[PDB]
Swiss-Prot record:
PANTHER family, A to Z: NATURAL RESISTANCE-ASSOCIATED MACROPHAGE PROTEIN 2, SOLUTE CARRIER PROTEIN FAMILY 11 MEMBER
The keyword DNA repair appears for this protein: no
GO molecular function: cadmium ion transmembrane transporter activity; manganese ion transmembrane transporter activity; metal ion binding; symporter activity
The keyword Lipid metabolism is assigned to this record: no
Species, as recorded: Deinococcus radiodurans (strain ATCC 13939 / DSM 20539 / JCM 16871 / CCUG 27074 / LMG 4051 / NBRC 15346 / NCIMB 9279 / VKM B-1422 / R1)
Official protein name in the record: Divalent metal cation transporter MntH
GO CC term (a single one): plasma membrane
Compartments in which it is found: Cell membrane
A Pfam family hit: Nramp
Length: 388
């Protein structure tokens, strides 16, 4: 593949419907003041995903399998349940985003939107490796081109450069800002990948480590520029204008209207649907690998797909706002990150696991600082959600 090739394919996988929810709402409600969050969360994701990838290369096993073989039964069971909750919140945002996109495209109610998504995800579940390549290449194009749109639009929108520069200085402005900051971190780090991304020769093992290190930083850098662009465009579009339903995904197409014209609405919803269909399908398979890795057995794949749809339909029948619950799921995912980092930081520092590929002492320290920072942000948010 060409030089930039790997950076493009891995970046579209990072574009969750939860990124749309957090970037649009972040810019429309708090201007440019959360740009440092997207930047910080992206750098932390570069460290974390590198440790996750180097653990699979050095040890030949994934994190659930290493926990199952090395830790006591009650701790394996605890981390299995915690990993299953991460899979629930991860698939909830993706499945609900696709159903919402169906509603934006056709006008059907959210219930039937989730039913359409359910048939598609059930049918996509049956298809083997043959057939996924034409569909995953098409959804990659929609999501990639909507990302290039925001990269171009961030220049044509003429954003307030003084406010853009100030937005890179870390500032939390109220309790609602921390809630959205936590959601941005949860949407960037993606703890479900931590448990799955891990899934011979020392000189050959170092080649894959150096090769993976370059590809993930090019992809995270591209995904980080697009996320900041989507937030900055949302800030320039809505912030300080008292627009009806500002930051909401039902009116988010207005961010690309001066560029795409009358096509902005369909092109946004199509990209939202493609971002949710591919993500909901790969995540429910990743949930199957995680249980088999933790427990040594797995439930039928159709049953897991059904259980993951139950929170989606319940949220719909409750009448809850889809854009609001997409942000909540990313907030919950951010609470699962510190639990995922503890086995990651410990295993990658052991020679009997990594061999000659033991992590540098400095990057282990940086990883623990990242874990302490996220615990601090989660506890700070949890304190203000219980009064105090
Ligand atoms: C923790 C409870 C998890 C329930 C499954 C049983 C288990 O994993 O062992 C725990 C046992 O109570 C040993 O303290
Ligand atoms: C806030 C931080 C935002 C981060 C934005 C990142 C990269 C800038 C855009 C990179 C892609 C460049 C496309 C823009 C462009 O070239 O459009 C210019 C237009 O032609 C003029 O007439
Ligand atoms: C990593 C990013 C580095 C952060 C620094 C600048 C933002 C980069 C984009 C430059 C935006 C213009 C900066 C600016 O205009 O600052 C105005 C001044 O600070 C008002 O008093
Ligand atoms: C914290 C311990 C580790 C620190 C490195 C990682 C910081 C990560 C995010 C910034 C949140 C902390 C804010 C302090 C960042 C330094 C700074 O420039 O402070 C900006 C502003 O003045 C502050 O009030
Ligand atoms: C940080 C490393 C990866 C980031 C690379 C960002 C480049 C985005 C691609 C095309 C820009 C669109 C150009 C459109 C020209 C008009
Ligand atoms: C290929 C040219 C466009 C093919 C159909 C795309 C239609 C489109 O982009 O716009 C949809 C909307 O109806 C516009 O108002
Ligand atoms: C009201 C809900 C009824 C059925 C839920 C969907 C169950 C039917 C679709 C699940 C897929 C399935 O049935 O599995 C078939 C087989 O295992 C693979 O070929
Ligand atoms: C709490 C939620 C739990 C819901 C409980 C199930 C609800 C029934 C739905 C579909 C059953 C029919 C679809 C599956 C039947 C064919 C699938 C199959 O392959 O056989 C099933 C069996 O597990 C060997 O694999
Ligand atoms: C371990 C706990 C994990 C997640 C708790 C979920 C967050 C606690 C409840 C969130 C409150 C909420 O639903 O909304 C918050 C509001 O939107 C903003 O101030
Ligand atoms: C949220 C809290 C996550 C746990 C964080 C630090 C404790 C890790 C235990 C220290 C290393 C044990 C070996
Ligand atoms: C939470 C504060 C940081 C906890 C550090 C725990 C730790 O560093 O464990 C030793 C390490 O595993 C040895 O390589
Ligand atoms: C939690 C109690 C304090 C943390 C226990 C010490 C952490 C630790 O050093 O254990 C990691 C590993 O065993 C080092 O090789
Ligand atoms: C304000 C920001 C606060 C965020 C906190 C700082 C996060 C960024 C720090 C370093 C990034 C460098 C990571 C680039 C890739 C490094 C490779 C790696 O992660 O691990 C390899 C290991 O060292 C093999 O032995
Ligand atoms: C507690 C709240 C405020 C604290 C804020 C600072 C966080 C604590 C400092 C470092 C964390 C532990 C990192 C240092 C231990 C790393 C383990 C290590 O590097 O050991 C060598 C490794 O085994 C090579 O093989
Ligand atoms: C270099 C090595 C040193 C590591 C950095 C030490 C940082 C903090 C020490 C612990 C601070 C204790 C307070 C816990 C954090 C908190 O809750 O903040 C509340 C706030 O301080 C009330 O105004
Ligand atoms: C993720 C799973 C759950 C882990 C987070 C929840 C609890 C963390 C313990 C406390 C961690 C540090 C939180 C203190 C935040 C702080 O520094 O200051 C807060 C204070 O209220 C300033 O007003
Ligand atoms: Cl261990
Ligand atoms: Cl401003």
């Amino acid at each position: 593949l060409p030089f930039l090739g790997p950076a493009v394919i891995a970046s579209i996988a990072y574009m969750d419907p939860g990124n749309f929810a957090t970037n649009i709402e972040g810019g429309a409600r708090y201007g440019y003041s959360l740009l440092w969050v997207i930047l910080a969360a992206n750098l932390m994701a570069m460290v974390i995903q590198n440790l996750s990838a180097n653990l699979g290369i050095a040890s030949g096993r994934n994190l659930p399998e290493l926990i199952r073989e090395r830790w006591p039964r009650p701790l394996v069971w605890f981390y299995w349940i915690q990993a299953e909750l991460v899979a629930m919140a991860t698939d909830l945002a993706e499945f609900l985003g696709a159903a919402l996109a169906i509603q934006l495209l056709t006008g059907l109610p959210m219930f039937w939107g989730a039913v359409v998504t359910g048939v598609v995800t059930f049918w996509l579940l049956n298809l083997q490796k043959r057939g996924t390549r034409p569909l995953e290449l098409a959804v990659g194009a929609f999501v990639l081109m909507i990302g290039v749109a925001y990269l171009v639009q961030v220049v044509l929108a003429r954003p307030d450069l003084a406010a853009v520069g100030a937005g890179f200085v870390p500032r939390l402005q109220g309790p609602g800002s921390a809630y959205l900051a936590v959601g941005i971190i949860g949407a960037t780090v993606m703890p479900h990948v931590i448990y799955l991304h891990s899934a011979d020769t020392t000189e050959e093992k170092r080649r894959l480590v150096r090769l993976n290190r370059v590809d993930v930083i090019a992809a995270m850098g591209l995904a980080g520029l697009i996320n900041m662009s989507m937030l900055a465009v949302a800030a320039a579009t809505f912030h300080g204008k008292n627009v009806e339903n500002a930051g909401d995904l039902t009116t988010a197409y207005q961010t690309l209207t001066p560029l795409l014209g009358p096509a902005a609405s369909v092109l946004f919803a199509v990209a939202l649907l493609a971002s949710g269909l591919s993500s909901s399908a790969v995540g429910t398979m990743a949930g199957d690998v995680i249980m088999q890795g933790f427990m040594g057995f797995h439930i039928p794949l159709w049953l897991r797909r059904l259980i993951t749809m139950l929170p989606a339909f319940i949220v719909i029948l409750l009448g809850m706002d889809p854009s609001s619950v997409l942000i909540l799921s990313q907030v919950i995912l951010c609470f699962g990150v510190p639990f995922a980092l503890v086995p990651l930081l410990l295993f990658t520092a052991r020679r009997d696991v990594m061999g000659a590929l033991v992590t540098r002492r400095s990057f282990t320290v940086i990883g623990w600082v990242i874990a302490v920072i996220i615990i601090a942000l989660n506890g700070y948010l949890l304190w203000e959600l219980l009064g105090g």
